[PDB]
Paper text:
However, much remains unknown in plants about the unique organization, regulation, and localization of the enzymes required for de novo biosynthesis of pyrimidines, which are potential targets for crop improvement and weed control. This metabolic pathway starts in the chloroplast, where aspartate transcarbamoylase (ATC) catalyzes the condensation of carbamoyl aspartate from aspartate (Asp) and carbamoyl phosphate (CP)1,3. In general, ATCs consist of a catalytic homotrimer with three active sites in between the subunits that can be allosterically regulated by association with other proteins. Each subunit folds into two subdomains of similar size: an N-domain (aa 82–221 and 374–390) occupying the center of the trimer and holding the binding site for CP, and a C-domain (aa 222–373) bearing the Asp binding site.
Two additional atATC structures reinforced this hypothesis. The second structure, obtained by co-crystallization with CP, showed all three subunits in the trimer bound to CP. In both structures, the three CP-loops in the trimer fold in an active conformation but show poor electron density compared to the rest of the protein. In fact, E160 and F161 were traced in only one subunit, and modeling in similar conformation in the other subunits caused steric clash and charge repulsion. In turn, CP showed equal affinity for the three active sites (KDCP = 77 µM). Interestingly, we did not observe substrate inhibition in atATC, in agreement with the existence of a mechanism that ensures the reaction of one subunit at a time. This mechanism relies on the projection of F161 towards the three-fold axis, which prevents the CP-loops from reaching simultaneously the active conformation.
Numbering used by the authors:
A (entry chain B): 79 to 390
B (entry chain A): 80 to 390
C (entry chain C): 67 to 390
Write the structure that this text describes.
Amino acid sequence: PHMFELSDVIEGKQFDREMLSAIFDVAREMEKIEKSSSQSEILKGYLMATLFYEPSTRTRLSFESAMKRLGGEVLTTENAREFSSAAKGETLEDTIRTVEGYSDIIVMRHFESGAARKAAATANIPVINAGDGPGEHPTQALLDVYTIQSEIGKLDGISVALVGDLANGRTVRSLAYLLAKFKDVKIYFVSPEIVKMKDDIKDYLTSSGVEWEESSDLMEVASKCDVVYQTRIQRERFGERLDLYEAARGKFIVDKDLLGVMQKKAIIMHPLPRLDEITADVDADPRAAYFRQAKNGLFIRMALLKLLLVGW
Amino acid sequence: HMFELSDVIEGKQFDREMLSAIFDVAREMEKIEKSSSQSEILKGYLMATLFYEPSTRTRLSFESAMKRLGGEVLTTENAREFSSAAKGETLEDTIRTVEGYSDIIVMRHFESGAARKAAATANIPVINAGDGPGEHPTQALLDVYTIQSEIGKLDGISVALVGDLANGRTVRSLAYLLAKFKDVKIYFVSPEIVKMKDDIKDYLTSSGVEWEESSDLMEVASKCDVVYQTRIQRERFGERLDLYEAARGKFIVDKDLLGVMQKKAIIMHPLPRLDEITADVDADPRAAYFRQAKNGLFIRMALLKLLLVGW
Amino acid sequence: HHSSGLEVLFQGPHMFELSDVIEGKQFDREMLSAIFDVAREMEKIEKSSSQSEILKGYLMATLFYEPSTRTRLSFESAMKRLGGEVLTTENAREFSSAAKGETLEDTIRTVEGYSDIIVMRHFESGAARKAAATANIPVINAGDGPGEHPTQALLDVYTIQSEIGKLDGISVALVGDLANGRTVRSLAYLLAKFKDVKIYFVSPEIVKMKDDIKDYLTSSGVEWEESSDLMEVASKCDVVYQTRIQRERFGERLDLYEAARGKFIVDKDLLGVMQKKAIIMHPLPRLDEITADVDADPRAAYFRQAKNGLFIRMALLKLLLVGW
């Protein structure tokens, strides 16, 4: 019995290997609570205020479900830009000092990088970053690592393929950041050259002693990975280079043929939403883990709510 | 025992025995709502709403229903704007995502056919809250329940369906369920150009339901247990503004219409109304449309109860 | 047990009528004393670890036709802190069937079938009274478009009593757009129910307080003074109650705009001339009319004011639904 060492959940760098492992154990105890017939009272009497400045399905509803499955209540604000007094020019710091009067924990998806950290510094209650505009989405990174552990049974000694828009991809960057905390990890960067991973993550993995390789050949890489983590490449990333778009057409898709070359114990992940970059006929394969991944978000967010409000 | 329906999607799922049994559950839900004790029947269950179109009655009655039973609700309104359906996510993906967080899904989509796709996809129950311009089965249930409740029986009744019959999803759906009862008579009251389509006419004929068409709401209304009013949108007359003008003032529920009605008849309207029912009708005890909305709460309590914990 | 120093001689219900919360003139001294006493009991419930069940089994319906942060969330928090439930409707203009032309009376007679209390912020003055007259359940006015915001008036007076320790004998500066200031007019109205109150109207002449409120204060024997000099007035006030002046109010008179520039701002210079036991209030939201560096001063009471809104709204919910 003791206080959680984090006062807020804002950024990947707040987490070390031991913290990640301990949180993942709590997520397994939350999975047992969620499966139970009887209503948990762990967070009875606690109120969570949401502040969604951008749209969300998975993050907004998993946090609300997590709070209610633990017996807590929720005060929602979506389109804090239309329906909140943030539509009358109110600063973030004012919104936070107002809303903490009514609540015990704040969950915020802002439109501007740095918003979540300013919120945490201003508030005298815990803040969770639910996505920080072009910034960090740390509970996405936590549930992604948890899903790998849950599906593969290990984080040490794995090969992970990060596919799609790696240059501008916040989830692939954050997943690489956290995976670098385990041993004997290999990461494959699979992308068109035009959206390859930025030097900052490459140099970070090297300095962490994580082996990495760059490829434009998903079929080859997929055959020797434990995990294929898929993300969208937006057409607009090719700018006027429609020659380069044509060359990438059909080369970074998860389809039945790609599952054909993958190992029987490997998995397909996607933070979601997806468009055509994973074909609907892949969903029937037991190795398609993206819906299980979204459900693990419920257990990870239950664990963080429980830890921030009542401790270990 | 287990409810015989896995989902509530379309009126054709219902036989008259199932309707009568649901109405008995709705009366048990009315006693629960009236009690001063918080029900715990649905304690621990979570309902996710998905509203892709605006709603007052349907949205708030489902949420009230769940909470009056001690359940909780995860709401999504304008799933077009504030959901990740605002970034092109397919219905099947939304449903497989949302079912990870909830025990029952209530959905008002913008496209006919969405609710049955959601039911087929989900491993939890789905209730159709309005399938865009298609099935709105809980409206049809609360409509038939309101008639049973106000009139005291469904066999042997006389119902006027008034307004846009050609295009009227709600009046067509109410005709579909009333024809499961015996010795029913239906009056179709409308401008001739928006008369009831031939499919519903043949359906009533085959069902052994007597029907009559009329443009004379004063003569019909004197002979009916129920006047079920709906609005005729100007759009339905298209370029026929002459037929619009000829209908003006002729399909209104007002004090003069109530004056020719039997003392135990009722006015119903799915709502919202504009001027097709005058405000001064509201004070008449026969004005049943606010009681009808409240009956939605008891019907929706009954369906949530039945789908989640059974009879 | 009387906040006025004397012992409470009788235990039992009060003598007032309270079935809706619509307008300031409902709030006689007996009712203000009761609401403030219940608000102090709610501060203890809110502090406590155990979940209150005072309003278990009650359902609130909200109808917000205008944007809100403090009023919408404080009502919902208030209901849930007392173990009640909430059915929300924000954007009742876009996401409700009032997007399809429905009358307010039809909305109220619909929603009352699903709920035990309605909290409404409409866009038209007079909506809250029409909703109360229509409904057979309690209605609370959460802001009646350009009309009254009575729960703000309540929490403002309660905040003054809490921060200063009295209402009789205080000096209050009402600052900003007084001519069109819903909250300053309602605050002036409730303060006139107490003894030896002094009010300072601080503003540009162009947005000075209307004669109806001046005449009311004169009739009620409340001393008042007009000023365009916030630095002079702030030094002799218990309370500086700040509000925004919209540039739009100067019309074509940009000479008058220029002349008011930086004259009606609460900043560290103004705090400098203020008494140690004085306070800054603002109903919120603010923009530039209170500088961020004022927030660290312990006299900056506008976030404590907003919190007091929770305790007031908990008190009203209890008084309306379960009574004495």
